[PDB]
Structure 1
Amino acid sequence: KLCSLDNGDCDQFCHEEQNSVVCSCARGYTLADNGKACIPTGPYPCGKQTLERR
């Protein structure tokens, strides 16, 4: 499985291993249990537009 097809299903960073892909996330996010999604740890995570007025 490959990072060149749908970014390995990763929300953010994808890197290839011998047979598999490994996903990871920027600081301020935690990789979800499914190994693909990046979950923000706070209300103003990096790289997100501030569209929900808190």
Structure 2
Amino acid sequence: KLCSLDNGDCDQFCHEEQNSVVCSCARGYTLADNGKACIPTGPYPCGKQTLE
């Protein structure tokens, strides 16, 4: 299933490279150490409602 399975446990983008899941993130995010979560690099990352 890989990416077909709950987006491969990826926070955002999911790719299947050599029968293995590979997560990536939109511009302005950094792939976490677990190689799945996406971490914003600034106070106003894309795609996030400004709910302060």
**TM surpasses 0.5:** yes
TM-score (norm 2): 0.93
1: distance between equivalents of 2:28 and 2:39? 8
Considering only aligned residues, what root-mean-square deviation do their CA atoms show, in Å? 1.0
The residue correspondences of 1:7-26 to structure 2 (distance < 5 A) are 7-26=7-26
Unaligned runs of 5+ in 1: none
| Count of residue pairs brought into register by the alignment | 52
Q: Which has the higher helix share?
A: 2
TM-score by length of 1: 0.90
Specify the structure having the higher radius of gyration (Cα).
Answer: 1
Q: CA deviation at 1:18?
A: 1.8
Runs of 4+ in 1 over 4 A off after TM superposition: none
Mapped partners of 2:38, 2:29: distance in 1: 6
